[PDB]
């Protein structure tokens, strides 16, 4: 069955971006999805993304601008340190001028650069470039 809705959402938006659709659909919704899509829109890979709310299971409509290449998910839920994220970004990111690493810290869902400038770290959600 389905036990990782975030991996399915990221794979669906990756497939629909690679085909070239403008508005996509995600059948689950969660806190992690909506904060991940807000940090997506803040760093500027998507546009105005919508969400429908009901009493059963909300769905998310995401506008696309084509500014994404590939957007994967670390599974299972690994943990990193501050002396460790450089090892991840050297062998995972395509470059150091772009490509971001998102991670869950004590202050919430956030990317690795402001985690480096704020000096805290934790479990890692996924990646996008």
């Amino acid at each position: 069955v389905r036990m990782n809705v975030l991996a399915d959402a990221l794979k669906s938006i990756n497939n629909a971006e690679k085909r070239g659709k403008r508005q996509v659909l995600i059948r689950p919704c969660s806190k992690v999805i909506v904060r991940f899509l807000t940090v997506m829109m803040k760093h500027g890979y998507i546009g105005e993304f919508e969400i429908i709310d009901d009493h059963r299971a909300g769905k998310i409509v995401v506008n696309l601008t084509g500014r994404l290449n590939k957007c994967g998910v670390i599974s299972p839920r690994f943990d990193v340190q501050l002396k460790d994220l450089e090892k991840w970004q050297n062998n995972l990111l395509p470059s150091r001028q772009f490509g971001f690493i998102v991670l869950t810290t004590s202050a919430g869902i956030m990317d690795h650069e402001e985690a480096r400038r704020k000096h805290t770290g934790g479990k890692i959600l996924g990646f996008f470039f």
Binding site: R22, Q23, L25, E50, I52, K59
Partner: protein
């Protein structure tokens, strides 16, 4: 389609699709009321009965259980209620 807008299409598009593929989630069946031509009391019945039902006063049976919607007794007046 490339820029297919899934925010608000025509209502025929949500009509032709499935009850669960619809982006706003709502079923298709409804409630109804129907009487006997030789009586005064009128009762309400669901569109899919699944049990045989007779009108109150124990005069004449009203619906019949089918695979789909319940077929009504011949010669009965009805109208769909909505809110």
């Amino acid at each position: 389609p490339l820029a297919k807008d899934l925010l608000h299409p025509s209502p025929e598009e949500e009509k032709r699709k499935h009850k669960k593929k619809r982006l706003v989630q709502s079923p298709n069946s409804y409630f109804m009321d129907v009487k006997c031509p030789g009586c005064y009391k009128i009762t309400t019945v669901f569109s899919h009965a699944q049990t045989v039902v007779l009108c109150v006063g124990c005069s004449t049976v009203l619906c019949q259980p089918t695979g789909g919607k319940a077929r009504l007794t011949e010669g009965c007046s009805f109208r769909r209620k909505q809110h």
